[model samples]
Target: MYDAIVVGGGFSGLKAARDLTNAGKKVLLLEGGERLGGRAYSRESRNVPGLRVEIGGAYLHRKHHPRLAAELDRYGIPTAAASEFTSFRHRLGPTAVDQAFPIPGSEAVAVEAATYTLLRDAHRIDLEKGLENQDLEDLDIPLNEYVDKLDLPPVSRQFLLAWAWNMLGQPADQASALWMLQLVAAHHYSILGVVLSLDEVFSNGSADLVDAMSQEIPEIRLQTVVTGIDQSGDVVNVTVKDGHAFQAHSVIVATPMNTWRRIVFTPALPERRRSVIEEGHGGQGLKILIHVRGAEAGIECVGDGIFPTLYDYCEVSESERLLVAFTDSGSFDPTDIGAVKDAVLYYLPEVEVLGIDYHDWIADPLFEGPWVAPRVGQFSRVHKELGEPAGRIHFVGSDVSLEFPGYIEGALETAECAVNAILHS
Candidate 1:
């Protein structure tokens, strides 16, 4: 029997397995797909020798992603600069211009107003009074309704839309405003993209970072999809496809929250946990990465398109020459391949489509979705409960990190914390 059976082999699972292994514990990491890096998998499917990249899990921002950087540095891998790697870019739009909040000083007004509303909605105004009991009840409202009530100008409303996309990874029409407010207190302000540049982003590909993690642990299982896990007994019985069962002392479910619903628990997970999974979309992600040399996709170093919109084909790369153009999940969906191509061209007008790689994270059964963003009413409560480990099952992933959350840093921080929990428990 292994000491621990880690489900999912992405950053969280791998981090768990590595830490346990370092403690001289036997760990078996079962990955549902025939890949090791989970969302971080990349290959040269379009015919580029040793020029592979990934469909999931990427970017190496500085402040926003410290844990990822620490791991990379630990492996002695050099950072790649997006600016250095980018060639040029395609322009998406001055989409963010309508509500430009261009008056540099105007931001103070916006932030204060935003925070005031957030505190009221999250019921966080009384930090000393039942703040923990408030279950983020106020943010459960929809974004459109909230904005309408705010009665802001068209351009200011447009700015709200842009912020919505960044936080929800979806269009404002499909998001909640209350959740956006809560994010302020939940995440750090200074730890954003201001640190990582196109230079680090400008790397050749994401494989270098995956390789760094892989070197520390040689034994990795790819394509081992776990079908069921039964935790009714002292020894948890894990069932993988082809009718294989393994018993382990403990289990770490680093799998995405959406997929966890179908995993039949012996005693069954509580209704609340089940609800978190239900209110989520398993395949809600859509993004396409483009490799263009010397071409520019008009994008701010620390910004993207308006809410529920695509970038002017923003490209982040190294050499300040190479470009990685992107569109959000919603922009990726309902978009024809040709239409997407045209959009890319519309931005550049002259840049050639060297290669195109898109990730439909929601389509894959293993993940059931790509990334996790709190839906209406559940944003404040989902991770608040999930980040905690149950009797024998522990949870870890970027979706649950409180500091520098989202992106890769959250994943490591959560995993490390889970490890500590397991050690003490």
Candidate 2:
């Protein structure tokens, strides 16, 4: 029997397997997909020669994500700023304007007021403990409702709405206020801090870190879909799709929250845990990389409509530029180039569309959503239980991380915690 079985080959699973293996423990990691790096997928850019593009989970904060930063340093990998926008564009409802970072005049005042209110509440929660018995019941409403209660100007409200959509991948109405507060708190109680933290990207590609951690894992089985997990006794039995079963002392379920329903647990999960998994998260957003000709470098765009944010991803050449855009789920089909061009033209009217690239994370069976963002009341209702292990089966991922939930940092944080748990148990 192996010392531990890690299900899922994402950063969390890989981190767990690596840590356990380095500690002289026998480990087995099973990934259903043909490749590793579950959501942090990187590949050579089809549009730009000698460049890389990330289909999922891109960018990392040098100061905020300590674990990821340490790993990057350990591997001797370098990073560069994800974007250096010299110009800013805002399309709020009917008004479209080109300005610098931080809106001017009354708009800035309103944004600051909203920021103050959010930070005031965000500071209440302890980052390590999270929303456990905080008694801040009033702050646990939907983000839209929280914003509405602030009663800011229409323009200011639109700015916050756009930010909400960009951060959560869903509208404010679908996400918990506590969740956003926690995220803002993670960024040192500053909204701009949150933006600045995501400014760095891997110089080579995220695949470098993924491969580095994966190389340390002793055994890994890809395309091995785990169907059932039975941990009723001392030994945990993991059954895969091909009727092959493996026994291990402990099992760490590092899969996304959406995929839990597909696997049958022998003792069955608790009612609350099952309910949270059934409802899943509200991160059904689409990321599209648009190749355009005629757009200058360092241009950033923000819209309050379907597409929340667009940025100059990379300047391939003097004449070619790549722009990354995001849209909420069901807003529109990203594959439709004509529709995307029409939407993008509203901000940059002079740019000519070359091609578009994206990944349909919402439609993906392994990952039903992009990232985990709890719905209203969900954060307080199940935050503690989600991270707690059930018998020999432990859960670890960005979804359950207390510090930087829904982020790469959060995945590494939970991986360390779960590994420590197994070692101590």
* Best model per TM-score: 2
Q: Evaluate residue 421 in candidate 2 and report its C-alpha lDDT on the 0 to 100 scale.
A: 94
lDDT of 2 by residue, 237-285 (tens): 9999985898899999999988888899989987778887888877766
lDDT of 2 at 274: 83
Question: Lowest summed lDDT over 10 consecutive residues: which window, candidate 2?
Answer: 93-102
Off by over 4 Å in 2: 46-50, 93-100
Winner by lDDT: 2
Q: In every candidate, how many clashes are there?
A: 58, 0
Whole-model alpha-carbon lDDT for candidate 1: 0.58
Q: What TM-score does candidate 1 get on C-alpha atoms?
A: 0.79
Off by over 4 Å in 1: 45-50, 84-135, 149-156, 190-199, 202-204, 281-283, 290-335, 345-355
Q: What is the lDDT of residue 227 in candidate 1?
A: 69
